[PDB]
């Protein structure tokens with residue numbers, strides 16, 4: 001997270017950390033609890049190539065990464081079939097836990113948005129995670145969960161920004177309809193935040209609008225963070241999650 | 243170049259090295275002289291974002307990088323407008339030199355193929371460059387230009403290979419019509435070879451079949467190197483480079 | 486610490502971590518509380534060149550580095566004047582804290598040995614710290630304090646070991662009288678353990694026999710870790726520490 | 728070499744490069760040809776632990792490192808027995824080549840100094856090598872041999888400088904009698920120059936005054952480069968090297 005602050009303990013109870021087996025269970029992506037037994041995350045975190053499930057673990061919200069670990073094995077990994085690379089979309093995946101987790105005030109699910117919510121510019125939204133605090137600048141120990149408020153940029157405006165300073169033709173769409181843009185040169189997600197949530201407050205309720213997907217650098221001018229637009233994949237999600 | 247050998251001085255007179263201004267003019271990509279004043283390379287070597295030409299130089303055929311450099315400035319860069327990322331194709335670009343270079347047996351152009359050449363499996367082809375000799379293994383000094391013969395794999399066969407062991411649905415095309423696959427787990431190009439040429443001996447003549455574009459690792463089982471298919475963009479090329 | 490285990494919460498209440506001002510207060514060396522207001526460490530951890538005290542802090546016994554830090558400023562650093570490089574000895578230094586710490590069962594001093602104790606081979610001894618778990622392998626988060634039992638090797642036997650396979654003449658002493666050897670190819674200290682304690686259980690009492698000083702690699706065959714022999718410097722220590 | 732320039736091809740014909748086997752024959756220290764079959768270098772480059780001679784090679788003077796290699800195997804490595812670590816001195820070693828090399832204008836020996844030469848401050852001396860051009864800044868390809876004029880600092884003055892800003896007692900000698908100090912905050916040797924020569928011109932003749940040994944940083948204030956004083960080891964050298 002670039003430009004943010006450490007999260008209050010009572011915030012983002014749905015945040016999760018994905019760990020890969022490497023000398024220790026190392027954090028590599030975020031995710032969100034969307035059902036007591038299901039984690040929502042980015043396809044690019046667990047694909048396109050099929051991985052051995054023995055090498056992955058999920059960690060539920062912790063104020064400080066690695067300090068109070070209670071690792072949870074995954075029973076199944078479901079990656080959207082249209083996914084191959086982030087720039088072409090469908091960057092979304094589901095992790096079914098071996099067992100449903102206990103639901104409390106400190107650890108619980110985030111609500112998915114109704115199909116009609118477009119999250120237009122002006123919406124108050126935050127992205128959270130334990131990623132780098134700037135380009136090539138890792139979050140220092142004790143690794144607090146961070147948050148940052150990021151402004152939403154309408155898709156067409158964002159698509160135009162991506163063409164600014166690039167050879168790509170205007171008629172060539174960079175930002176797709178299954179994507180959403182948020183952030184600016186001072187507020188954005190960074191390496192390690194991928195797969196985590198972008199939540200917006202709508203009439204007093206938190207709804208997950210996006211999944212951290214890709215970008216052209218952390219908090220880089222004219223290159224807002226790109227997220228997978230959750231509403232676009234509700235039908236697919238509902239095919240697996242109760 | 244993975245699994246190859248140092249190229250003989252008289253081979254590949256069209257090979258070029260692209261340099262970026264660093265603590266020295268550091269090699270970062272290959273290219274090929276397709277006309278006395280035009281270098282063909284990959285778009286990803288110079289885009290999709292526009293870069294300051296002041297930070298780029300072209301070096302013509304040399305046996306060892308950096309030893310006897312005679313760097314050339316680039317007048318202009320033309321990147322195919324359909325290019326954004328390597329996996330969606332159109333990974334091709336043209337660099338116009340300030341003046342036409344002097345053609346000799348030592349340095350000269352490579353012929354482009356006629357639109358009908360498909361370069362099917364079995365065709366003898368070589369990829370050349372100063373790229374890594376293996377994953378995370380940079381070419382050692384004195385940096386000789388290397389070459390390696392790479393086996394061609396038909397597009398659909400290759401597309402099926404890329405779906406092996408992946409979540410990606412079969413209805414999702416990974417290898418596109420403007421791409422070509424060559425290489426195996428023993429012979430392939432690697433980091434730093436991008437933009438360079440894949441050339442095939444067709445009935446006694448050397449034709450450039452591809453431009454090193456991408457892949458999923460260097461000489462990795464069931465993931466051959468992917469090249470931009472030159473015949474696909476002949477008309478685009480001929481829009482800028484004189485016939 | 487190479488080849489050890491995480492230390493139990495109630496063990497080594499004298500262990501301390503030395504921190505240098507970086508993107509965070511990063512651990513760089515160990516030390517031991519030998520008096521409520523004095524920390525014993527290795528000179529090479531703080532010299533031979535004089536450094537700005539503002540860039541240094543002491544952290545008392547904690548189970549996991551960085552998690553619950555309560556950093557302490559150092560009022561004064563006293564480095565043995567005979568120190569220049571580890572291989573010529575006198576690798577010992579004292580840090581005076583600004584205030585005497587609160588002694589408890591969880592945090593208290595370690596006893597220094599009487600001058601006559603030689604700590605001969607066979608003596609049960611442990612080295613503790615947050616150093617690498619192997620050559621070029623840093624301690625993984627959450628950075629637990631580790632411990633390992635290390636075999637003592639008599640000085641001359643050790644000095645002969647250090648000449649094995651070397652051009653160095655036998656008349657050249659490598660292991661000095663103010664040094665002590667401990668460790669083998671399975672158990673030893675490693676980068677980041679320097680300055681910490683080697684403590685031995687002598688007839689029911691824990692005595693600090695050495696200070697981690699140097700060696701030729703971590704847990705390397707025929708090259709035991711070298712420690713500054715505490716008894717050798719008792720008078721020097723007692724010139725400053727009550 | 729910090730603060731220097733590329734050496735003219737005609738200078739330092741005695742400079743050699745020591746190479747260790749690692750993916751390629753990689754440079755790791757300098758040396759000087761003091762006899763057609765003997766190379767003088769630093770003990771720390773080839774010790775204190777005995778190394779397999781098959782992993783070492785010597786390269787005679789090359790204007791550009793790695794470009795025209797003609798590697799020479801070593802027949803024997805003789806390290807001073809008093810050597811253990813650089814700060815305690817005796818940092819000197821001899822390499823006997825399998826065969827004597829051809830002597831020419833471009834490649835030949837450097838003269839050792841007479842026992843009486845102390846090389847006081849003011850003497851014009853240069854250190855040469857292919858080492859880093861600054862702290863953590865490697866020599867960029869094509870790796871030219873560099874040189875730099877370094878001022879000599881009298882031993883006592885140098886020893887006092889080393890105690891400046893340090894806890895070490897004044898009565899504790901840091902700079903020993905078998906050492907010699909040269910350099911300042913703008914001119915010095917650096918990582919990779921170790922083992923190479925410090926040569927001074929005395930009445931129109933080049934004499935090797937020192938072997939690059941150690942120091943605290945490349946061109947660091949009050950920490951001049953430290954060299955093994957060759958005159959101190961003439962008897963030892965003469966025990967192995969003829970004439």
Ligand SMILES: *[C@@H]1O[C@H](CO)[C@@H](O[C@@H]2O[C@H](CO)[C@@H](O)[C@H](O)[C@H]2NC(C)=O)[C@H](O[C@@H]2O[C@@H](C)[C@@H](O)[C@@H](O)[C@@H]2O)[C@H]1NC(C)=O
Pocket residue numbers: 101102
């Ligand atoms: C999830 O919440 C459950 C309900 O509180 C926990 O089970 C309960 O564990 C208590 C002690 O942690 C125990 O007093 C309760 O009797 C027991 N109740 C039931 C219905 O199981 C559960 O803790 C786990 O399960 C218990 C039985 C032990 O095996 C513990 O070691 C487990 O932590 C909570 N943790 C989960 C399910 O992840």
Ligand SMILES: *[C@@H]1O[C@H](CO)[C@@H](O[C@@H]2O[C@H](CO)[C@@H](O)[C@H](O)[C@H]2NC(C)=O)[C@H](O[C@@H]2O[C@@H](C)[C@@H](O)[C@@H](O)[C@@H]2O)[C@H]1NC(C)=O
Pocket residue numbers: 829
């Ligand atoms: C040392 O000097 C000799 C005289 O220059 C070298 O021999 C000469 O090598 C020439 C090719 O390098 C060759 O055309 C000359 O006929 C030959 N002359 C003589 C007197 O032999 C010698 O080169 C080595 O030995 C010769 C015989 C060949 O085997 C070469 O390949 C060798 O390099 C020089 N030695 C070295 C190690 O350079």
